[PDB]
C-alpha cells in the first residue's frame, strides 16, 4: 500500500539522468551549509522544530515602538562607499594587514553599534531573557534610545548595567546613575522592575525604584513615585532579573493611586504589573530604552529582611523528583540482591513484635 507525497519530496528536483554533468559540492562545508538551509524551512512532515517548542513559531508582533529613525538610502550608501575608498586606498593599512598587526578602537565600535543595529541586539537579547513575555506579554519594542545604568562601588569604581550582565546586591544597595540624551521639551518616566521573585503571586513583580516627569537628562528633578529599594533575592533561588525601562510621556501625567509612601519598605505596597500600569497611561507613555541585569543572593541581602522589612529570611532549595521505580514484584526474577533496598521505606531494622 503506497501513499502519495504531500507537496514536494525533498530531492526530487535534480535529474538522475546524466549525473556526470551535474555540478557537485566537493566540500564537506558547502554541504553543511545547504543542509542547515534545509533545516530552516517548514517541511510538511513531522520535524524537530514541531515537537521541540520553537516557542509559538510565527508570532504576529504587537509592536509598541518608538517609530524608526528616518534617514535617506542613497546618501548613506554613497558616504559609506567613499569612506571605504579612502580607507582601502591607504597603503599603511595594507602593510598593517599583511604583517598581521592591527587593532580596533573598541570604544568607537561601541559608539557605532550603539548607532545602527545595536538597538536590535538589545531587542533580541531582551527576547532571549523573556523581558517581553513577563512585562508586555504579547509585544515587542525596539530600544531606540541607549540607556546607561551604573553603581558606584567605591569612590573610583563604577559597575555598569548592560543588558544581561551579572551584578551583586553589594553594588545594588545604592541608587543608580543614569545617562541618556535628549533636549528638554522632553518628559520622561523611568522604571525599575523585578520580573520574578514575588513570593505570593507567581504572575506579579516588584518595582524597586520608579521615577516620573523627568525633563531632559535631569535625573533628580524627576518626581519619584517609588524611592529606591535595593534588589533582594532569596538564598535558594538564584539569579533574579532586573529591568530598566524608559517611557516618553507627551503631556505631564500625575497619578496618586500609583504614588506610594515615602519610606515604603512594605512588600504588599509594591505589587506590580507592567501590563496594567501601562494600560493606564498608554496613550501618553511610549516605550524607549532598555538595560537589565542578573542578580543572585549575596550576604548583604541578610541585612535587608532583618533591618528593612521586619521579615524572616526565606531560604529555598532545589528539589529533583524522587527516582522512578517499577511496581514492586512479589518474586523479582533475575534481579540483583540490592533490588530489595530500592523499595526500602527508610533505613532501620524494624522488629515488629520482638
Amino acid at each position: 500500500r503506497r501513499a502519495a507525497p504531500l507537496g514536494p519530496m525533498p530531492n526530487e528536483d535534480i535529474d538522475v539522468s546524466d549525473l556526470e554533468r551535474l555540478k557537485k559540492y566537493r566540500s564537506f562545508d558547502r554541504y553543511r551549509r545547504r543542509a542547515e538551509q534545509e533545516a530552516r524551512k517548514p517541511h510538511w512532515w513531522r520535524t524537530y522544530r514541531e515537537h521541540f517548542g520553537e516557542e509559538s513559531g510565527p508570532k504576529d508582533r504587537v509592536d509598541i515602538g518608538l517609530p524608526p529613525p528616518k534617514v535617506s538610502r542613497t546618501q548613506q550608501l554613497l558616504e559609506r562607499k567613499q569612506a571605504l575608498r579612502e580607507l582601502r586606498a591607504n597603503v599603511e593599512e595594507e602593510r598593517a594587514a599583511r604583517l598581521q598587526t592591527a587593532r580596533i578602537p573598541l570604544e568607537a565600535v561601541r559608539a557605532e553599534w550603539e548607532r545602527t543595529c545595536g538597538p536590535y541586539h538589545k531587542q533580541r537579547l531582551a527576547e532571549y531573557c523573556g523581558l517581553y513575555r513577563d512585562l508586555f506579554h504579547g509585544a515587542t519594542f525596539v530600544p531606540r534610545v541607549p540607556l546607561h545604568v551604573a553603581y558606584a562601588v567605591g569612590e573610583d569604581d563604577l559597575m555598569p548595567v548592560y543588558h544581561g550582565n551579572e551584578v551583586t546586591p553589594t553594588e545594588a544597595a545604592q541608587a543608580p546613575e543614569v545617562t541618556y540624551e535628549a533636549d528638554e521639551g522632553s518628559l520622561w518616566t523611568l522604571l525599575l522592575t523585578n520580573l520574578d521573585g514575588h513570593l505570593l503571586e507567581p504572575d506579579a513583580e516588584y518595582v524597586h525604584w520608579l521615577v516620573t516627569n523627568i525633563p531632559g537628562n535631569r535625573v533628580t528633578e524627576g518626581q519619584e513615585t517609588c524611592p529606591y529599594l535595593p534588589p533582594f533575592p532569596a538564598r535558594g533561588s538564584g539569579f533574579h532579573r532586573f529591568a530598566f525601562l524608559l517611557f516618553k510621556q507627551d503631556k505631564r501625567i500625575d497619578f496618586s493611586g500609583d504614588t506610594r509612601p515615602s519610606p515604603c519598605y512594605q512588600l504588599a505596597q509594591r505589587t506590580f504589573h507592567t501590563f496594567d500600569f501601562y494600560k493606564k497611561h498608554q496613550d501618553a507613555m511610549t516605550p524607549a530604552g532598555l538595560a537589565f541585569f542578573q542578580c543572585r543572593w549575596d550576604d548583604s541581602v541578610t541585612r535587608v529582611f532583618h533591618q528593612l522589612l521586619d521579615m524572616r529570611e526565606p531560604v529555598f532549595e532545589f528539589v529533583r523528583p524522587p527516582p522512578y521505580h517499577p511496581k514492586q514484584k512479589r518474586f523479582p526474577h533475575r534481579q540483583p540482591l540490592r533490588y530489595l533496598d530500592r523499595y526500602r521505606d527508610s533505613h532501620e531494622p524494624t522488629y515488629g513484635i520482638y
Binding site: 537579547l125 533561588s237 539569579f239 542578573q294
Partner: protein, 143 residues
C-alpha cells in the same frame, strides 16, 4: 504576624536564563550519529564567507544570542580587508566584549579538523580567551 511575612512553599522562578547559569538545567545529550554535538547551552558558530567573517553565539533553540558580523557598518568602517586574519581576530575581540556585556562567560566551540588547524581560527580563539570568555561549557549538575 506581618502581612508581608507570607511567602508560599514553592517558588516560581520565571526567568529562563536561570538554570543554565546554575548549570542544573537540561543539556541536549544525543545525536552522536551526527555532527556537531548539539549538547550545549551556548555554542560558538563561525561562518566564513569568501567576503565576510561572521562569528555568532548560538542557543540550541537555533536563536542566535550575541553576534559579531563584518557586514555591520561598525567594524566594517574601522579596519581594512574584511577577509583577513586581522579581521577574524577583530570580530573575535568584538564578540568577546559583547559577551561580557551579555554577561555570558560560556559557549562551546566545535571547529572542523582542517579548520581548527588554520590560523584565523587560532587567533579567533585567542581573542575570546583574552576577552575573558571561556569555551568548553561547565559540566552539568546531576546530569
Amino acid at each position: 504576624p506581618v502581612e508581608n511575612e507570607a511567602v508560599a512553599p514553592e517558588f516560581t522562578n520565571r526567568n529562563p536564563r536561570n538554570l543554565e547559569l546554575l548549570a542544573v538545567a537540561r543539556k541536549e545529550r544525543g545525536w552522536g550519529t551526527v555532527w556537531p554535538s548539539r549538547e550545549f547551552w551556548h555554542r560558538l558558530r563561525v561562518i566564513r564567507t569568501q567576503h565576510h567573517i561572521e562569528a555568532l553565539v548560538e542557543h540550541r533553540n537555533g536563536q542566535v544570542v550575541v553576534s559579531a558580523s563584518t557586514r555591520e557598518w561598525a567594524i566594517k568602517k574601522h579596519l581594512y580587508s574584511t577577509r583577513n586574519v586581522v579581521a577574524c581576530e577583530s570580530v573575535g575581540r568584538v564578540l568577546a566584549e559583547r559577551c561580557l556585556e551579555a554577561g555570558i562567560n560560556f559557549m562551546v566551540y566545535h571547529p572542523t579538523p582542517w579548520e581548527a588547524a588554520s590560523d584565523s581560527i587560532k587567533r579567533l580563539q585567542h581573542a575570546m580567551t583574552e576577552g575573558g570568555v571561556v569555551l568548553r561549557e561547565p559540566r552539568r549538575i546531576y546530569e
